[PDB]
Assembly symmetry: D2
Homo-oligomer: 331 residues x 4
Amino acid sequence: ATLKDQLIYNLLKEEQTPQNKITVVGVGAVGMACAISILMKDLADELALVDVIEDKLKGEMMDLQHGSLFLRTPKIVSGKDYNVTANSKLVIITAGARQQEGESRLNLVQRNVNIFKFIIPNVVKYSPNCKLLIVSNPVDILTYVAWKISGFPKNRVIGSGCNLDSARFRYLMGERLGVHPLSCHGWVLGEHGDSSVPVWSGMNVAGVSLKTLHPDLGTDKDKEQWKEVHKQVVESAYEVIKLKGYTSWAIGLSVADLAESIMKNLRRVHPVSTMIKGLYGIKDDVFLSVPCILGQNGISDLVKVTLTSEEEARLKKSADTLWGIQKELQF
Amino acid sequence: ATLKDQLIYNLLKEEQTPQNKITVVGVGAVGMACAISILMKDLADELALVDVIEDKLKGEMMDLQHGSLFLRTPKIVSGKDYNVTANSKLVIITAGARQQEGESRLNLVQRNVNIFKFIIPNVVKYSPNCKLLIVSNPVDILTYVAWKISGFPKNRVIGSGCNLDSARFRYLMGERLGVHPLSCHGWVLGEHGDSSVPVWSGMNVAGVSLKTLHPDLGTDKDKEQWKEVHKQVVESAYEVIKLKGYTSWAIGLSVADLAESIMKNLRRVHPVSTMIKGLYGIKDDVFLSVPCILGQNGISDLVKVTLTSEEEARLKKSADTLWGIQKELQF
Amino acid sequence: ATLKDQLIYNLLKEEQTPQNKITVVGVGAVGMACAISILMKDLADELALVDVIEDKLKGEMMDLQHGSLFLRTPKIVSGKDYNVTANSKLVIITAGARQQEGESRLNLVQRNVNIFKFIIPNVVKYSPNCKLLIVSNPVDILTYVAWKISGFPKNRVIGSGCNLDSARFRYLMGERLGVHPLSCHGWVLGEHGDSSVPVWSGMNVAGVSLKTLHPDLGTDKDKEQWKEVHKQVVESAYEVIKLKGYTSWAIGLSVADLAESIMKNLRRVHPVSTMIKGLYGIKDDVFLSVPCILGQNGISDLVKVTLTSEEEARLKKSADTLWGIQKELQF
Amino acid sequence: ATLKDQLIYNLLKEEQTPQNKITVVGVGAVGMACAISILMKDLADELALVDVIEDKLKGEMMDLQHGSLFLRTPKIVSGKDYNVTANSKLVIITAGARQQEGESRLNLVQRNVNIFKFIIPNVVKYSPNCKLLIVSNPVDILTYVAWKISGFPKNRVIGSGCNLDSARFRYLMGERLGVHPLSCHGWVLGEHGDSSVPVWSGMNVAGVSLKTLHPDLGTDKDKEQWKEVHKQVVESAYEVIKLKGYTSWAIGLSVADLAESIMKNLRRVHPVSTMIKGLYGIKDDVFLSVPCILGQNGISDLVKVTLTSEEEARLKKSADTLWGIQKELQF
Ligand SMILES: NC(=O)C1=CN([C@@H]2O[C@H](COP(=O)(O)OP(=O)(O)OC[C@H]3O[C@@H](n4cnc5c(N)ncnc54)[C@H](O)[C@@H]3O)[C@@H](O)[C@H]2O)C=CC1
Ligand SMILES: NC(=O)C1=CN([C@@H]2O[C@H](COP(=O)(O)OP(=O)(O)OC[C@H]3O[C@@H](n4cnc5c(N)ncnc54)[C@H](O)[C@@H]3O)[C@@H](O)[C@H]2O)C=CC1
Ligand SMILES: NC(=O)C1=CN([C@@H]2O[C@H](COP(=O)(O)OP(=O)(O)OC[C@H]3O[C@@H](n4cnc5c(N)ncnc54)[C@H](O)[C@@H]3O)[C@@H](O)[C@H]2O)C=CC1
Ligand SMILES: NC(=O)C1=CN([C@@H]2O[C@H](COP(=O)(O)OP(=O)(O)OC[C@H]3O[C@@H](n4cnc5c(N)ncnc54)[C@H](O)[C@@H]3O)[C@@H](O)[C@H]2O)C=CC1
Ligand SMILES: Cc1ccc(C#Cc2cccc(-c3nn(-c4nc(C(=O)O)cs4)c(CC4CC4)c3Cc3ccc(S(N)(=O)=O)c(F)c3)c2)s1
Ligand SMILES: Cc1ccc(C#Cc2cccc(-c3nn(-c4nc(C(=O)O)cs4)c(CC4CC4)c3Cc3ccc(S(N)(=O)=O)c(F)c3)c2)s1
Ligand SMILES: Cc1ccc(C#Cc2cccc(-c3nn(-c4nc(C(=O)O)cs4)c(CC4CC4)c3Cc3ccc(S(N)(=O)=O)c(F)c3)c2)s1
Ligand SMILES: Cc1ccc(C#Cc2cccc(-c3nn(-c4nc(C(=O)O)cs4)c(CC4CC4)c3Cc3ccc(S(N)(=O)=O)c(F)c3)c2)s1
């Protein structure tokens, strides 16, 4: 008998079926930050990685496996073939093309769409019941693209959206007030990044409305220039990109936070990008961030935030602009 | 009054002194993997980062700060100046040079020695009571260098050593047996990397000696070639370097595991590199990995492993080789 | 040589000094629930237990010690003598008397005051710099008592207060809305228990004011009777006492949450009982729960909640009542 | 519209099917310690409690629910009817009768059997695919009883067995050596409690066999009396029972450790009680503790520890004695 059989007596020929499986597609800096954050939060019993760069994919997988002693996720797999992703509960898309020198963002949009046309059908083939969490940028457009290609109902297609923008907002608010972001509440909604909308009416500590304490909050008359807090939500992302080349740690932690609510059926509220047609006069198929209740079925509910006329008009303008771009995309 | 003062009444404006502070020096892939792993294990109330590349250093710090909402380490700081490291309990050195084309390894090591001659006095100046955890390679030589330059007692200078090699051993052992590495026990000692020593006599599951079950274990007569487990401990690191360019995740996790024992005073046993003169037959000032008990005072004790004649001769040969190299380095 | 000395080489025999020590005084159901919750959140490197019942104290300590394999708090000690508590960062008082048949509540409180007159000087003797977290009831009165006897500055004497009441409020609010309590925000302030004050103006999800959506919120005109949420905050505690004899698990979890903010210096906001003279219109030395920022210095700051006339009159009435009782107690 | 519907827009009529559900039956001290330890380790997305004492059951449930803010287990339910347990992955039995004054242990055996004849059929009715983890004493007899009544294959019926005995052994070994139990390895096998067997051949630190260092280890000639370490594994349990009335914290943590391996499919090795017929000459249906590999299918494999003739004869004697009692039990 082999040493294994001398040492170990086998009771069961196991069926080996994954119960809490997560897949990450695209193992760049963002995908691997998502991966490590999920691993260190014990959110999955199996982690699958997919990419098209075969050596990079296998190297990252092996690096994680070598740390298995320090983890409680017993199976880490990888491959270019999507059979490694079968029966995932949650599939996180972090794939994208590399912007070339002198290439505009507009050119990236169709290249990432072309990547999604290859990825998303293979995801559905092997995990027809999964939740899809889209991180690749432009995230609101690509969440729509993923929704359309997958055929999924809208509860099962989730865009990272303004989850990270809101985390940045609360960090910066916390720095102004000397309070941990966990206790500084404030919401950034709409489009991820440049066009996001700070909802000044919801900014509060311990339920005390900042806007009621300081009616000029967020306006141009504001002597304390709190609008600069939202300007820095946008500008600080561009700054990290300039300083280190890309962002990764903050989005990875924010993605693991969303995965936690989904895998643990927590029904916490997150600002994520969701199919918003039927609200705010929006009549087109577009994805924008609103506060959503997240659990094991994806987005089961959303909060209807009371918006001023100006705030509603900004969200409607994002919806119109997104539909304008989406109708020109080739599927 | 300002909004903050309208909202918040201050009881004490006190000079915050750090209680559980860790510094990582060098924010390459290895340093940041250490940083993220430490953050997600709640080991510190303050994390300081140091490097010489100023924009990269600030970008990585800010990226971590943007994730504060998802963390419980309230202060993350950085700078090229070592006053940001003051009063650290643990200082992790992952700094190093990159080999230039056609540069000999000996010259690369001397460049790393020169880097340590700059770093180590500045660390001591601002945290004279810290523990030093050396990760930069060649790790056993540079741990000696750190020990010589710092003036620290040997309990407070620890080299990552074979902690990671042993983790790889147990992952590979677990894969052969179908058992989690947490339950697969085995020790790789001596030098990190190619010259490491697999202690076949300690390989066991549930206290069952594999060597006693299988007396050919690890020999050339072994029909199952268990020696290939140790060969892959060495080769897989080179393979990961070839596939993705470097290793980072597994070393980051293993470093956070050592930090956990030190910061929480666990007195767990780890294979780390320590000044071994007078033990294991070594008569020179060199650092080799043996099982060490780690706690709030660093290495308080070490385990005297019973070695065969061959294993003892291999460690003595490593010590002779390390001593020859160290006297060829300029301090 | 002994087996230990054959196996282990000692580098330093040093006098272990505790770095992150917590003491719980009183090992009833409440004290032990605090103990287990603190152990499972890795908040301390040393846990000390104190009581006057010597056999029970030793049995509980040993029970915890038998679980050390599953914990990461390496030292658990106990004793009737307070030298076991030396150098605690945080001291949690859950000690109290049991009401005797036919004994008036005022006499029961005086017996608890007498207990504090024994405990508090001995705590101060061995940990003069600790933070005091008072859980014993009546908690607001006894927090004042602890503050008066200790001589501590007010930032270092904290009463559990309405931390638990607010947790119950948010659980009940979450149940009504189908949202996790982590995302349901609402504050119960003032006295712990029957006289607590629900701040309807701060009740919100995602920054959306329920009171603004529903102006009758909490009034008698409310067709949905949201006032019953606060009524159940009070009644459910009495119900648990009736059904199982006492409450323990929820208070233990809420105490560990406060300990987490203090031990890790998080500067999160909690509703805890603090010396409120000069704020909120109170002119006597009394402790009432307001939102406080908690960190390594205890209460460094507090939030000034905007109150209605009725809410302010209720807090002033609580202060008048507390002051009348305190002058009827013998110190 | 109601306030809920004004605030929240519903996307899905959810099916509400539990994915990682655990049930605890019997909410005495042991059951509630299991419950809190499982809750604080995030092992379940739904926790169900069952007992026959209806008020106590509802009070404990409510106490846990009031701490929901501090947990990430979103549904806690209870009831005397087993429909609350439907679709559990893992069902933990901690039910038992109260020993009356002057009542022998022998009388308790049939009373606990009678309790199991009511419980186990109802568990199977609502969770036919679950794993059963038996904690009630006498644990090896009652694990057999549970196996027989359930009809389950032997991989899905697990007795707590010697898991806690081994944890106590490693704690006491750690205290002798000054090393954390996590790094002190040693196995207690066979029957839980009085008749358990310390396997001296497996006792080691860092793979260094204590028995080889000290051949008198565990014998009567041992000047250091290491056999007293195993005597205290037994005696310390009786001591805690004498000092505080019962044990609870250590078993609760040990049970949560087993639940972790099962729910996370970790395939760690634990000494748990398993149907051992076919090994050691045992030819009867009995449950004894050996090192077992635990995962999502229960006990999938077990380690065949090399035993001395004396050790094998003690295990065989336990098997004979257990079968002698079991054949007299009424089903
Ligand atoms: N939604 C948010 O808040 C933010 C999203 N992001 C976005 O994440 C995405 C990835 O970011 P990085 O990792 O820095 O970029 P990256 O270029 O380093 O990595 C992208 C990976 O996608 C892989 N890829 C390309 N085609 C593929 C295909 N058919 N199938 C599988 N993999 C494929 C690539 O090989 C690459 O390894 C970017 O679009 C980035 O803008 C970045 C941070 C914040
Ligand atoms: N001991 C072990 O088990 C392992 C150790 N390592 C070693 O970790 C070290 C770092 O690895 P990588 O991050 O991949 O290399 P890297 O070259 O990307 O990172 C080195 C960083 O040190 C910085 N640096 C140079 N001089 C400095 C100085 N005086 N002060 C502060 N920073 C300085 C550099 O700017 C760089 O950011 C390497 O030496 C590597 O061999 C890598 C994996 C396993
Ligand atoms: N503030 C809050 O939100 C809540 C606070 N509590 C309060 O916690 C306190 C303890 O609650 P339980 O454990 O259920 O009561 P308990 O009577 O079972 O525990 C009290 C323990 O204090 C010990 N004791 C008496 N005098 C002592 C002295 N000088 N020194 C040390 N120990 C002494 C007693 O031996 C006893 O073990 C009670 O006063 C209770 O009202 C209970 C739940 C919620
Ligand atoms: N295997 C091990 O390592 C150890 C096991 N134990 C055992 O755990 C068991 C429980 O211990 P404790 O909580 O201290 O005892 P306990 O008597 O306080 O609690 C037992 C609970 O079982 C309930 N019960 C009785 N009949 C029931 C029925 N048909 N259905 C549902 N519930 C029923 C009882 O009402 C009671 O609430 C005991 O047998 C104890 O010996 C204790 C610690 C270590
Ligand atoms: C006609 C056209 C319409 C859209 C086009 C386009 C485009 C494109 C292509 C590559 C990258 C991006 C992009 N990445 N990125 C990042 N953010 C982070 C972070 O860490 O936050 C890291 S990189 C951001 C946010 C910015 C840093 C703060 C954008 C901008 C963007 C723009 C538009 C939508 S949207 N609502 O239209 O989908 C978005 F969601 C985001 C954008 S061309
Ligand atoms: C005269 C001279 C002799 C030696 C010289 C030299 C040298 C040098 C310079 C840069 C990097 C290294 C080096 N990095 N590295 C890594 N490992 C990992 C991981 O993921 O494990 C990632 S990179 C390894 C280990 C190998 C991958 C498995 C080495 C080799 C080494 C050699 C010698 C000592 S030692 N015992 O003398 O300290 C070591 F500890 C390690 C080595 S110049
Ligand atoms: C002249 C006098 C006036 C008052 C006297 C008095 C008194 C006394 C003596 C023992 C126990 C208590 C008490 N315990 N207890 C618990 N709560 C929990 C929980 O799980 O929440 C578990 S038991 C509560 C709260 C209630 C269950 C919901 C009280 C009442 C109380 C009363 C007064 C103050 S106060 N503001 O004056 O400090 C308090 F803080 C609390 C009270 S004698
Ligand atoms: C003819 C007969 C045969 C058996 C009978 C019987 C019986 C009985 C009835 C109630 C309680 C027990 C019992 N509980 N208990 C606890 N332990 C702990 C802990 O914290 O460890 C807490 S209480 C222990 C262990 C001891 C404290 C250290 C026993 C003893 C025992 C005896 C027999 C088997 S077995 N192998 O036959 O199943 C066991 F598993 C355990 C036993 S009458």
